[PDB]
Design a protein around this nucleic acid. Structure first.
Lengths: 61, 102, 93, 77, 46, 35
RNA sequence: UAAGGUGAUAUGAACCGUUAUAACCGGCGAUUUCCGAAUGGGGAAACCCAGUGUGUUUCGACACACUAUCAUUAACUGAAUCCAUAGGUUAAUGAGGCGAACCGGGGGAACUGAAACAUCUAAGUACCCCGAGGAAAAGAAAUCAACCGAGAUUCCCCCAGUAGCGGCGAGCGAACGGGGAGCAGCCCAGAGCCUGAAUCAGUGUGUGUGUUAGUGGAAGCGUCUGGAAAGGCGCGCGAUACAGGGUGACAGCCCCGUACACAAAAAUGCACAUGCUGUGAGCUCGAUGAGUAGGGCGGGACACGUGGUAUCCUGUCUGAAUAUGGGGGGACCAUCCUCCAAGGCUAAAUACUCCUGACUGACCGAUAGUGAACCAGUACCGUGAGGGAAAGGCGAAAAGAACC
RNA sequence: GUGAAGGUGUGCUGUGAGGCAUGCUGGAGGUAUCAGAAGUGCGAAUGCUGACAUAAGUAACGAUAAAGCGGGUGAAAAGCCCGCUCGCCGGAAGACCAAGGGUUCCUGUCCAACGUUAAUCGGGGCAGGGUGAGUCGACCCCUAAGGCGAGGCCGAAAGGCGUAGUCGAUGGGAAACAGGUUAAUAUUCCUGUACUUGGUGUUACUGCGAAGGGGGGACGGAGAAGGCUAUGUUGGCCGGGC
RNA sequence: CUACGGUGCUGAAGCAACAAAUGCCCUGCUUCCAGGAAAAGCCUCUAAGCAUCAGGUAACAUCAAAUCGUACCCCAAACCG
């Protein structure tokens, strides 16, 4: 996953940063709603948005 | 480089189970090692309304020190120490006194 | 007009109170815990885009963190911002 | 501050000594006056708070030579 | 009766506040002596 | 159950030793005539 | 480098990994809110308010960037005023802030001692300020010596509590000379021949070597007591390893290590090898630092308190000679010895420790040792500067006491 | 560890400081000897720190506005809740802002400590909940005193002063009322009725434009009325009483 | 309505006269001497500027009004003692 993204284009990289935060908003709504018994996807998605914003700001320069 | 690992049939060298043989269940962080069926204690487990509301005198196994166990050789029949050699580019646990790989 | 990834970070949590549920049944008002730097325009833009509903007026307030004594020390909870988003006539979530 | 712009004479300190040798602190201020010097290079007058020792450095060395030692030092005039 | 301490935050922050201490040489030495001591609160401010 | 609280002394005397000893301000005993 | 992990109080909950990226450790990189020199203006730090660009825009707007002052320099345009300055703008640079001590400089006490006290002392100390560096400062003879000579500074041991200074009181206190640590001398005031000519720097590959993760390590069993053996008794083995620590009591041989032998993607310290760039040799000649030296006055520094008193510094007032000349040799003079001021640079020996690593102790062992063995500069106290605590130990293991 | 130091007894013997042996606790360390070094011996310093007595189960229990009952809950009620009386304040002991405080607000829970007694109660513990603004306030625009202050003038240094300018309210600038509502918020929520300022789309006749000019803003003490109104009082009306 | 706490549906009259402020008219009026802020918002005049551009003016239409404070105590058991 950290390696599969370094064959993506920048616009490909950016549209999955949009899907990650929409997933992150989906999970953050679910955790407060009494749902999301799988309370480990939060830490995983938060480090998935960091994984791509790192890969964003490195091919930008 | 640990000498005592996840699933090793070990023997206890010290402390009320001196001579008894069991298998390691999990190596903890602080040099304490759970051995299967060896270091049994008697936990007066208090029943909480949920979460195993059976609240008997639960008999679990306590952690033993990792230096108080040694790996059972079973090809000599005795307790035995561990060394580290490199075979095939891999760090290999091997028994002392016969030098053979574990 | 707000950037989309900014709107995905303001709506923290839907707030349940039995005052908040009175507002949901009687004045069509969802009460949300929002981010601390949320403006009333950013909440209005985020409830409409992400909850797919219509919004008349967001009223906000900032809840002060309670001082609690866990164990023997003196801690303080975080201040949080609380919106009162009044939807117009059609209620989804 | 009471500094000559040519010789750099600070006020120095010393003692007052009485006839009973009682020491008490004083300051030997330099004999400073602001004086306008005529330069024929620049075709202007230039004023300098200069000591009376510095007025003797100026006519002995030149007023162009003194100012050249100020621009190359860091004084403003 | 009327005691010596009559609080006002405005008179507090203008006397002993961080910007009042950082205005002069001798208040930046106060703040240097309170970082060198290890003080939790540096000034009266928060 | 959060018990065995201490004996919080007054915040006036910084030497708890004399905290319960004297007020340490003025000692007024006024009747002394020795001549 | 790994079979275990998701920091701690802290259990869970939901998970991740199992020999190849779970975590951990290191190198480098990214991210790095807000305040604070705080720098866009302001402000009651952690907030308020913009300007101008540049986008993008659903037309509601939204992002990112810039915007401090000063110093130096350059560009443009620019008063009184004709030239011209001052000013004004826009760039590039650089600076500021914090830091424990050491260091250099500018200022500078008093208590105290004198058995009072004023000269003197304390003491150029405390402190305040300014500035700097890994050291700094000093430093290449206007130096000493004594008719022989020495040969830049710094530091250490003597000289020597001497010579002296001194209400000749309290006290202050040298040099010369000698033993050592460490030892380099060079530039400009200047034009030629020669003409990168070694130098000394920076930068870059290259080598040698550290630092920043690490790897391997060598050998013990029976037996009695005991809650438990590391103890006792018995009998072996390792040792370039019997430093230390842990383990249910005291372990060379259980563990971690230790002696030893090893290891580096990458980034750096040091040498060296240097290639490439900057300074710039060597030889011929000239040159030889003026409002200075000296002096009068007033102070200060020299051990030296103006005393017979040299020498140095300079606030003030003066004022040379220019190597056939000038300084010093403790008033002064004559000899004759020695040096060449009024320009500058300069390693080591030296001082220090906020901080990092090991290592040690006839150092402390919780009223001690840091104020602080413990969420301590905290609780508390004070408007504030500031002050400032008390508080360690279940057990081998929570087995931390089900149930009545 | 078949029991160390320590603690606590006892016995024995040294001229003394002391020494030794040991019964019990203690549950891991201690040191013949001979030398060595001292944070080397405490009853006093109105010594320092901690602990604990004493007075003494004494004084006091903080306004002499005052309480009495019946139910309730409870393990327990003089104090809590509810009720009926009684007393007290009413230019305050009531209602409401600013300051200051910072959750003391409300609810459910507990009653160790805290509360000068008890407590079921509480401003106590614990866990939830609660503060909604174009119009109120701040921010903001404007300045006063005063601060800071580019350049500037001064000053051993630090720095002092001050021009432009920029801050600084306690003053000046802009607009909402009434009902209803929550256990706790309301000029904020909701109904009703408004209003203010600014950005943005058409008409005719069109001169608009400032770090400038002039108005205005814009101001004293006291005193005297008149016109009112808030408010009150009575009548009338209305509902009810007999 | 219904635990009669309380919530809930109803809801009649809703006038007049008189007395009234220390409040408003009034930042007025009168009078005194002690002779009683400033700046902006506001209205207005234009200069450089500017051309049936840019603005202004009116009506109408749209949108925008951010951000903080907002609980509670205030003659007090929450402030200073």
């Amino acid at each position: 996953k950290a390696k599969e993204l370094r064959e993506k284009s920048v616009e490909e990289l950016n549209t999955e940063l949009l899907n990650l935060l929409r997933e992150q908003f989906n999970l953050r709504m679910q955790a407060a709603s009494g749902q999301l018994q799988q309370s480990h996807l939060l830490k995983q998605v938060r480090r998935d948005v960091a994984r791509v914003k790192t890969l964003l700001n490195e091919k930008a320069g | 480089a640990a000498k005592i690992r996840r699933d090793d049939e070990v023997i206890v060298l010290t402390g009320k189970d001196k001579g008894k043989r069991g298998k390691v269940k999990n190596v903890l962080s602080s040099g304490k090692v759970i051995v299967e069926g060896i270091n049994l204690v008697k936990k007066h487990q208090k029943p909480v309304p949920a979460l195993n509301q059976p609240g008997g005198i639960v008999e679990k196994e306590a952690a033993i020190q990792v230096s108080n166990v040694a790996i059972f050789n079973a090809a000599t029949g005795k307790a035995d120490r561990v060394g580290f050699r490199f075979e095939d580019g891999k760090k290999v646990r091997f028994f002392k006194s016969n030098s053979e790989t574990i | 007009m707000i950037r989309e990834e900014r709107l995905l970070k303001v709506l923290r949590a839907p707030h349940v109170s039995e005052k908040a549920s009175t507002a949901m049944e009687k004045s069509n008002t969802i009460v949300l815990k929002v981010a601390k730097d949320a403006t009333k325009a950013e909440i209005k833009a985020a409830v409409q885009k992400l909850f797919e509903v219509e919004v008349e007026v967001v009223n906000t307030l900032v809840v002060k963190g309670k001082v609690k004594r866990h164990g023997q020390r003196i801690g303080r909870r975080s201040d949080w911002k609380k919106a009162y988003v009044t939807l117009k006539e059609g209620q989804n979530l | 501050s009471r500094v000559c712009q040519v010789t750099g004479k600070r006020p120095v300190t010393g003692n007052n000594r009485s006839h009973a040798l009682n020491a008490t602190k004083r300051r030997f201020l330099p004999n400073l006056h602001s004086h306008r010097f005529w330069v024929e290079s620049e075709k202007r007058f230039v004023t300098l708070r200069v000591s009376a020792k510095g007025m003797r450095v100026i006519d002995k060395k030149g007023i162009d030579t003194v100012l050249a030692e100020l621009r190359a030092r860091g004084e403003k005039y | 009766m009327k005691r010596t301490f009559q609080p006002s935050v405005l008179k507090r922050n203008r006397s002993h506040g961080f910007r009042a201490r950082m205005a002069t040489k001798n208040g930046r030495q106060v703040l240097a002596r309170r970082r060198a001591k290890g003080r939790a609160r540096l000034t009266v401010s928060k | 159950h959060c018990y065995e609280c201490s004996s919080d002394c007054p915040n006036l005397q910084p030497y708890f030793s004399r905290c319960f000893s004297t007020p340490v301000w003025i000692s007024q005993a006024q009747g002394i005539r020795a001549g």
